[PDB]
From a paper:
[name]-1 capsid protein (CA) plays critical roles in both early and late stages of the viral replication cycle. CA consists of 231 amino acids that fold into two distinct domains, the N-terminal domain (CANTD) and the C-terminal domain (CACTD), connected by a short linker. Multiple copies of CA monomers assemble around the viral genome to form the characteristic cone-shaped structure of the mature [name]-1 capsid core. The core is composed of ∼200 hexamers and precisely 12 pentamers.
CA residues R18, E28, and K30 are highly conserved among known [name]-1 isolates. They are at opposite ends of the N-terminal domain interface (or NDI) pocket formed by the ends of two symmetry-related helices (R18 and E28 in H1 and K30′ in H1′) from neighboring CAs within a pentameric or hexameric unit. R18 is at the “top” of the pocket, whereas E28 and K30′ are at the “floor”. In the available models of the [name]-1 cores, E28 and K30′ interact through an H-bond and form the floor of the NDI pocket in 87% of the intrapentamer and 24% of the intrahexamer interfaces. In contrast, interactions at the top of the pocket (R18) appear to be more important at intrahexameric interfaces, consistent with the loss of hexamer-containing tubes observed in our TEM studies with [name]. On the basis of the data, it is likely that both parts of the NDI pocket contribute to stabilization during assembly.
Numbering used by the authors:
A (entry chain A), B (entry chain A), C (entry chain A), D (entry chain A), E (entry chain A), F (entry chain A): 1 to 3, 7 to 221
The structure:
Amino acid sequence: PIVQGQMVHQAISPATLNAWVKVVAEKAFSPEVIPMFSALSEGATPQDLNTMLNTVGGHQAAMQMLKETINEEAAEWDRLHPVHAGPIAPGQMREPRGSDIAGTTSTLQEQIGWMTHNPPIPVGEIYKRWIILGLNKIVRMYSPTSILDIRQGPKEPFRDYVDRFYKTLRAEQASQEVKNWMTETLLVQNANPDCKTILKALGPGATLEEMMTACQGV
Amino acid sequence: PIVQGQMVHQAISPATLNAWVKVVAEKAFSPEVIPMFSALSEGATPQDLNTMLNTVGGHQAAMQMLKETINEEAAEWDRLHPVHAGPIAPGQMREPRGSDIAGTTSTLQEQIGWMTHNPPIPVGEIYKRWIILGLNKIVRMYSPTSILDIRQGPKEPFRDYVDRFYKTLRAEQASQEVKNWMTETLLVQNANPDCKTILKALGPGATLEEMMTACQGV
Amino acid sequence: PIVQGQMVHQAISPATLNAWVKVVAEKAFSPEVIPMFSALSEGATPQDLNTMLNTVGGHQAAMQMLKETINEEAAEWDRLHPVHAGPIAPGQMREPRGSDIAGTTSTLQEQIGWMTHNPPIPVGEIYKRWIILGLNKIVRMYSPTSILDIRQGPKEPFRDYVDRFYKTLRAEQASQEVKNWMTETLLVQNANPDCKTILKALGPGATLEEMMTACQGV
Amino acid sequence: PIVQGQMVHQAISPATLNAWVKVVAEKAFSPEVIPMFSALSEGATPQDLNTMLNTVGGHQAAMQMLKETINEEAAEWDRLHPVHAGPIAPGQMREPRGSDIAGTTSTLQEQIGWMTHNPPIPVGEIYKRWIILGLNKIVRMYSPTSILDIRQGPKEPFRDYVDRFYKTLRAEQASQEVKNWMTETLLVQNANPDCKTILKALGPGATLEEMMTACQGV
Amino acid sequence: PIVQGQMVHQAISPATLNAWVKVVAEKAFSPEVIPMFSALSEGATPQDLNTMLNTVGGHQAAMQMLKETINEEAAEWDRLHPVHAGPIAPGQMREPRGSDIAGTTSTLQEQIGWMTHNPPIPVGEIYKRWIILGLNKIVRMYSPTSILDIRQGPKEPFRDYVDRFYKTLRAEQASQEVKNWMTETLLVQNANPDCKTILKALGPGATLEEMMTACQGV
Amino acid sequence: PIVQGQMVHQAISPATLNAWVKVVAEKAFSPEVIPMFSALSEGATPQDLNTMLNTVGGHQAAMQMLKETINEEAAEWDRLHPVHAGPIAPGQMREPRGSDIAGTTSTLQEQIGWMTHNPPIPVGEIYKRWIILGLNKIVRMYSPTSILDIRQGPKEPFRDYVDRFYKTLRAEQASQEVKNWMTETLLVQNANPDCKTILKALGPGATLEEMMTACQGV
Ligand SMILES: [Cl-]
Ligand SMILES: [Cl-]
Ligand SMILES: [Cl-]
Ligand SMILES: [Cl-]
Ligand SMILES: [Cl-]
Ligand SMILES: [Cl-]
Ligand SMILES: [Cl-]
Ligand SMILES: [Cl-]
Ligand SMILES: [Cl-]
Ligand SMILES: [Cl-]
Ligand SMILES: [Cl-]
Ligand SMILES: [Cl-]
Ligand SMILES: [Cl-]
Ligand SMILES: [Cl-]
Ligand SMILES: [Cl-]
Ligand SMILES: [Cl-]
Ligand SMILES: [Cl-]
Ligand SMILES: [Cl-]
Ligand SMILES: [Cl-]
Ligand SMILES: [Cl-]
Ligand SMILES: [Cl-]
Ligand SMILES: [Cl-]
Ligand SMILES: [Cl-]
Ligand SMILES: [Cl-]
Ligand SMILES: [Cl-]
Ligand SMILES: [Cl-]
Ligand SMILES: [Cl-]
Ligand SMILES: [Cl-]
Ligand SMILES: [Cl-]
Ligand SMILES: [Cl-]
Ligand SMILES: [Cl-]
Ligand SMILES: [Cl-]
Ligand SMILES: [Cl-]
Ligand SMILES: [Cl-]
Ligand SMILES: [Cl-]
Ligand SMILES: [Cl-]
Ligand SMILES: [Cl-]
Ligand SMILES: [Cl-]
Ligand SMILES: [Cl-]
Ligand SMILES: [Cl-]
Ligand SMILES: [Cl-]
Ligand SMILES: [Cl-]
């Protein structure tokens, strides 16, 4: 990663590596893996990001899908940033291609140069953007449950049902307004009859705290 | 977090991440989780705080309630800080909205800029304030016991009873004067008959050390 | 904690937090917990000290007694340092109250300002003084044994007896001269008959090394 | 490793050493070992690289093959960089031989001098290049499976088959275009009859996400 | 500990504390504990040394003997450094007493001042000297074996016998010349008959490598 | 260890100590222990080296042989560097003796002074040289196998045989040309009949990769 105020390079730490390998080995592609990844790659160069992706053993289907997604994003970047012919001037550096952002056709020195330029070309945050896009696709694809099948059991405490519901919902990754609708309709629509009666008596604009309060002892 | 005297940014450490994930996995929403959180987020940007909140897998009902609370606090902040139209002057930066404090509509650079300004706009401590507010609500809601039901057993050592009583009391989170009353009335009112007689003989203005001393061998 | 020679602030480390939580969970209130605490809070602000105290889950009776002790010390400090009315001058800062030293009515910036002033107002070491006072009271109260009941067994090696004796003695926390008397009288007075005869033959001014040497093979 | 902007030397850390020893002891020569190695040797001198290679106990056949490969690369470097006779001028340093890059005939000071020169002679990245070349040969040789023998089972979920296929493929280390052909032909050619029919119905230019989607419930 | 070239103070680290507590809990008073202690207290102030000594729970007999030894050394220091009456001059600091070196009557600031003075008064290394003296006494006293009782078994490999012999010898802590004599006489004098014959045939001035070589297959 | 470009002293770290103690406790005197030692003592003073050697509990026969070797090297150094009488000039420091390099008759300040002088007297790397010499002698002496007794089993895969062969060879520590001969003759001479026939058919100048390839399926 790159960390008076001058930005300087730093090798990826063994604690970062062990934490990334560990969370991938433990939690596969549960949603919380994506912020953890984002947490462990703060300020990372494309080289660091490729380092974390390549240290993943197994799950090579998902890693291959991630490669496909990264290639699509690189191709779109190339389409929106046509390269200019000519000798790079002294005091300047070439503008990056899609593969330069992905770290496969650029050196570490070129990445450092882009990231510390005035103004900065943040190839690290762009690449991380693409990676997180692909990770979202994988987390969505590998989710075992659908939000339409989360129904509260006849004896299931309301808290556990809400836990399952919002876990699945987080895996869905639909737009914010769509999730507003799902919370607005399915959560009460799929509760068990007693709690469902109580929640109907609560009212349309009910917060989650009020709903969980109403069905506590129930 | 942000840490000559000039304040500088720093990526959240793997030891911080592992400690937060670990304490959430172990202790759920026991009261001591809240200072631990506050301990691990010292000087955190809103990005760091969102990082710790998002790495929590499971307990998605509580995380959703936390989202609701944060939204209420953001709306109140917007109501008390009406935004001003106009171009941001060179040498200044825009004043944050509620969602800018919550880190969802502001960059890391804008957060750093607010936090290191003269005078400082401490969006990190404000956001942490809101988060801790929501965490207090969750700890209160998930507490299994009520302070009115803590009664000393006929053979229960006074120390264990006081432990249960003040644990539950800490979970209650009532105002200071209300807790003064609960200590003033319930603790002796709910002791077992022998210890209760001794404590009555102690006197109204008895400290906890005196009370535990009086019922030691008893 | 606060650490060219200029003193600068630092967030409490996850290794410090985990070590404190761990030693409290393991050893409860054995005497060695108090230096360990003092070890982990070197240069701590009142905020850091409150952080370590608040992360303790359970033992809420002892934590409540600690709160009482801290309140007494704060009240005495207020009685010996009467506050002065008037506007704080530019280039100065208000003198702290008892609750400001305890960190409950002062900001982190005010604590830093007092601790780095010329001359320094060491609110951190004062607060730690009060805390260690209360911890000593708790360690004394929770000790299971009394120094008058430590008697060497008929077959008990002298080393084990001395270990028990000085462990209990350390828990007693009596004044230095009182402990001089206890070592002077009880240790030989409570030895088993054979070792007791040998130690009587040693002489009044016998060191511990000589005494343990004399009853080795015995 | 070597890490204002001035590059400075640093001893290899115990966390790096323990991580390298650990991953070699655990994963032998699975492909992911090579990026991990590259991760733990960022900015390493030839001395650091030899340190990591020499700490490997066992697998001495592979370590010997690695020695052979490094010797070949050193001999080629010597053939392409003929040495020049004459006294090294004040303000200059000798140009390295193959064995100087491999760290066996050069001091740590000479390596530091080459790596921090203007312009730099990056003996560390050259040596790491050779080492990774040999590691690739070993990973290829020790792979238990061939890509032509990966066939989907009659009841095997398509995800598991793709996992095995791309794992083996990663071990193959063939050129990019050859792997394009293998993905293009073998993956569907070796699927089970039902999934194979579906994938044939998908079309020639099918991405992995589409293929795995089509054979999900199947 | 105290660590441009200016010496600066530093709080004792949790890794140091945990390592010291761990080695004391594991190895009691085996000889290797003393260098480990010396290793973990490099550059320590008397406050740090007292911190490590006080964190030891149990073994209070040995800790009490250590207190006695430290008191003797402090009294001797006071006898050889008579204090001078008079006001301490501006730009100077008082000369330390024995108890000031032991850290019980001196502040951390006074210790820092002595240790960083020109010329330095190294109270930390003096105190560590006294402590290591007492630790040597304890290791000597608690050793279970005597060097005169180490005899090679009739079937015991010579290597194991030499291991026991030099372990016990290290616990003896006799002067260098005395240990020269013990190696010179006892080692062969106490070997088993066959090895003893071989070693007699070796010659008087035999090194340990030659002796262990001669009785290898034997 | 000693680490703008100015070299500065540093206390040996608890992670270094724990790693050294751990690897000695685990692997005894396998060859890989020697580079690990060299890894953990990078830039070490003689004090640090003596610290690591002294923390080894047990194996006191080997530690005693190491002492003998270090004494021989010190005596040779004294024979080749005769000391000069006279007062050390202001701005200079005395030239070290053999025992000064071994750290037993020199202070830490004198070692630091030699190591940071212009030009440098590298007592740390000299002492480490002697230590590694003695460690090589011990690893050679304690090796359980001889290279002439490594014979491939009738059903033993060629890879395992080569592993045993080069492990033993590494323990032999013969000169480079001698090991060239051992690889040249014994490896094929001691293979099992079938593999031996294949390797004979390969040719005299066969690399290890070719040999292991030829006897793979065999
Ligand atoms: Cl994995
Ligand atoms: Cl999965
Ligand atoms: Cl890779
Ligand atoms: Cl851009
Ligand atoms: Cl952009
Ligand atoms: Cl579910
Ligand atoms: Cl419920
Ligand atoms: Cl969780
Ligand atoms: Cl819970
Ligand atoms: Cl998230
Ligand atoms: Cl404000
Ligand atoms: Cl505010
Ligand atoms: Cl309870
Ligand atoms: Cl009790
Ligand atoms: Cl606890
Ligand atoms: Cl307790
Ligand atoms: Cl709290
Ligand atoms: Cl004061
Ligand atoms: Cl004061
Ligand atoms: Cl007892
Ligand atoms: Cl005894
Ligand atoms: Cl291994
Ligand atoms: Cl293998
Ligand atoms: Cl080696
Ligand atoms: Cl070059
Ligand atoms: Cl090159
Ligand atoms: Cl397979
Ligand atoms: Cl599937
Ligand atoms: Cl202990
Ligand atoms: Cl013991
Ligand atoms: Cl103490
Ligand atoms: Cl002195
Ligand atoms: Cl002195
Ligand atoms: Cl023995
Ligand atoms: Cl033997
Ligand atoms: Cl050992
Ligand atoms: Cl061994
Ligand atoms: Cl020693
Ligand atoms: Cl020299
Ligand atoms: Cl030399
Ligand atoms: Cl073997
Ligand atoms: Cl094979």
